[PDB]
Each structure stands twice: as structure tokens, then as C-alpha cells.
Amino acid sequence: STGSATTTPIDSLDDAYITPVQIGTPAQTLNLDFDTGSSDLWVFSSETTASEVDGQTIYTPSKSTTAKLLSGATWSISYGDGSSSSGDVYTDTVSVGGLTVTGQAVESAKKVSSSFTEDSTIDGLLGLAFSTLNTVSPTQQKTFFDNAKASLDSPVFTADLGYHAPGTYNFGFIDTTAYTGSITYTAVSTKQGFWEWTSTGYAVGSGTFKSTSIDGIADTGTTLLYLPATVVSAYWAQVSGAKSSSSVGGYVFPCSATLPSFTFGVGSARIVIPGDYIDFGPISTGSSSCFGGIQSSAGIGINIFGDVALKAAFVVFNGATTPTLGFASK
Numbered sequence: 001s002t003g004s005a006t007t008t009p010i011d012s013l014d015d016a017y018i019t020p021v022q023i024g025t026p027a028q029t030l031n032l033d034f035d036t037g038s039s040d041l042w043v044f045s046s047e048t049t050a051s052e053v054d055g056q057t058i059y060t061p062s063k064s065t066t067a068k069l070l071s072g073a074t075w076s077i078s079y080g081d082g083s084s085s086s087g088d089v090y091t092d093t094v095s096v097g098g099l100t101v102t103g104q105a106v107e108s109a110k111k112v113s114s115s116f117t118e119d120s121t122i123d124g125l126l127g128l129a130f131s132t133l134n135t136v137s138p139t140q141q142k143t144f145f146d147n148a149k150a151s152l153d154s155p156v157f158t159a160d161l162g163y164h165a166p167g168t169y170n171f172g173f174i175d176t177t178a179y180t181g182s183i184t185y186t187a188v189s190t191k192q193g194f195w196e197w198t199s200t201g202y203a204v205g206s207g208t209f210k211s212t213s214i215d216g217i218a219d220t221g222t223t224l225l226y227l228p229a230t231v232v233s234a235y236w237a238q239v240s241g242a243k244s245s246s247s248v249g250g251y252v253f254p255c256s257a258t259l260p261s262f263t264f265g266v267g268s269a270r271i272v273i274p275g276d277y278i279d280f281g282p283i284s285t286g287s288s289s290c291f292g293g294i295q296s297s298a299g300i301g302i303n304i305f306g307d308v309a310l311k312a313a314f315v316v317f318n319g320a321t322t323p324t325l326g327f328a329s330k
């Protein structure tokens with residue numbers, strides 16, 4: 001079997017992407033943020049603290065005939081940005097774009113941080129990293145991708161994110177019409193539980209390609225591109241007036257400047273990110289200072305190929321016994 005679902009940006013800046021997911025019997029549709037950087041499927045629910053809910057659609061397990069409490073199981077997760085959530089666990093039927101999994105662990109959020117509460121368009125997350133990162137205790141639970149693997153025609157999923165436009169998440173098949181040229185595959189290390197890979201280098205605008213190894217993770221759940229300080233400083237040195245701001249907590253640039261493209265290497269292939277994708281708009285309403293989409297990973301400890309990078313390519317997440325990442329221009 002296969003699954004195909006449309007993903008839509010939550011705002012004019014592509015800060016996040018939401019994809020509709022059907023949970024329970026009868027179906028309860030929630031808009032979840034598909035995250036290849038985490039492994040928990042957690043939702044806002046009838047059990048979430050009333051004051052911590054602001055306009056989100058909630059999962060009500062009492063209204064689902066297929067919902068069962070996973071007795072004793074709890075979860076607690078903390079994200080790199082600082083956000084966090086926790087609660088109890090249910091098992092229920094979950095469907096994404098026609099692809100159905102029975103007995104999927106659905107983590108019901110009893111408590112959520114302010115970061116999620118203020119985000120009315122996002123009803124939860126659907127984790128797509130390796131199941132070894134799942135936070136359910138005492139019994140670790142599988143991801144939606146892990147549980148669907150046996151029924152999929154091919155153990156793959158693809159991300160085709162749009163720039164200020166809808167995109168697609170496909171499960172079980174590779175759409176040969178969604179990309180141009182060939183797909184370049186690269187090895188994945190699952191040691192830390194992430195889709196971790198090594199880029200072969202980079203270029204700024206029409207400058208020369210610097211062959212250098214950059215280990216990083218393919219993360220659909222992170223908005224920006226976080227790279228080593230050396231690389232980020234070489235990019236921002238080409239933008240007149242750009243500077244790292246302590247007030248803002250990152251590189252800012254004059255809203256009137258034009259941004260060069262950024263190229264990253266995938267084996268022998270090149271993925272070009274257009275300058276426009278690196279513009280995150282004014283730091284505040286009416287400000288003339290704009291926020292950059294390429295930031296330093298020095299304070300985080302890991303390089304992250306987030307939405308900025310991924311939306312410039314057709315990305316294949318190959319979950320075969322020896323996992324790989326596929327990249328193609330589109």
C-alpha cells in the first residue's frame with residue numbers, strides 16, 4: 001500500500017508545515033507537524049490543561065471506539081528550541097493520506113509549554129526519526145513509519161516541501177514526476193537516532209565550491225539551516241550590512257539587501273538554495289532589519305538541514321535495512 005498527503009505552510013514565512021492526519025474511529029482529523037528530527041506522535045487532547053489550549057483541535061479518546069489506554073505508559077519530551085510536552089499514552093488507528101496503521105501509540109499531552117499553546121494552527125507532531133528516540137517508558141513505542149513499513153510497497157517516504165506553497169509527503173513510493181534529473185543517494189548513520197548524513201561541501205552565490213565534510217541531520221521539524229560558524233560567517237560576509245545580533249540571537253541583514261544563493265553538496269551533486277528562501281522577513285513589524293535563514297549551529301551542538309534546505313530539493317527518506325537519503329533538484 002501507499003499514502004499521499006498535502007502539507008501546507010502555517011504562515012507567510014514557512015515557519016512550519018501542517019499535514020492532516022486521521023486518528024480514531026470515527027476519524028478525528030488533526031493537523032500535525034511532520035518531524036523527521038523526533039520519534040513521538042503526540043497530540044493536543046481532552047486531557048490537556050484547559051489554560052494551555054488556545055484554538056487547537058483536540059483528540060478525544062473517549063469518542064473513539066478503537067482507542068485503548070496503554071496502561072502505565074508515560075512520555076516526556078524536550079525539544080532543541082526549549083519547548084516541551086508530556087502526558088499519558090493511548091493506542092488507536094492512525095491514517096495519513098489513505099495509509100492506515102492500527103495500534104499506533106498516540107501520546108496524549110496532559111501538559112504543553114507556551115511555544116505550542118501560542119501555535120493555534122499546530123495540533124501536534126508526527127515523529128519520523130528512528131524509533132530508538134521515542135520517549136515512552138517503560139516500553140518504547142514505534143513511529144508511524146516503523147509501524148507502516150511491513151505494508152508499504154517500498155520502505156520509503158518522500159518530502160517535497162513548497163516555498164510559500166503547499167507540498168507533499170508520500171509514503172511507499174517515489175513519484176518520478178516530482179523531480180528533475182537523477183536522485184543522488186548518500187549514507188545515513190542511525191547512531192544518534194536521526195537521519196544523519198554528510199554533505200560534501202558548499203558555495204556562496206556564484207563563488208567556488210569548497211569541498212569539506214559537514215555532518216548534519218535532515219530535519220523537517222526545524223525551520224532554519226544551522227551550519228558551522230566558519231560556513232555561516234563566509235555566507236553573511238557577502239551581504240552588505242549583515243551582522244550577528246545578540247539582541248536578536250542570530251544574523252540579521254538590511255531588509256533592502258539582495259541575498260546570494262547557497263549551495264550544499266550531496267556526494268557529487270549540488271543542491272542550490274535560492275537567496276529568496278533565506279529571507280525570514282523583518283525581525284519586528286515595520287523594522288528595516290531582516291532575519292536570516294542560515295544561522296550558526298555552535299550553540300546547538302549539531303548541524304541541522306532544516307526546511308530552508310529541504311524545500312529546495314525532492315527528498316527521499318529510504319528506511320531499508322541499510323538506510324539512505326536521496327536528493328534531487330526540482
Ligand SMILES: NCc1ccc(C(F)(F)F)cc1
Binds near residue numbers: 016033038083115122
Ligand atoms: N522540532 C520540533 C518542534 C516543532 C514545532 C515547534 C513549534 F513550531 F510548534 F514551536 C517546536 C518544536
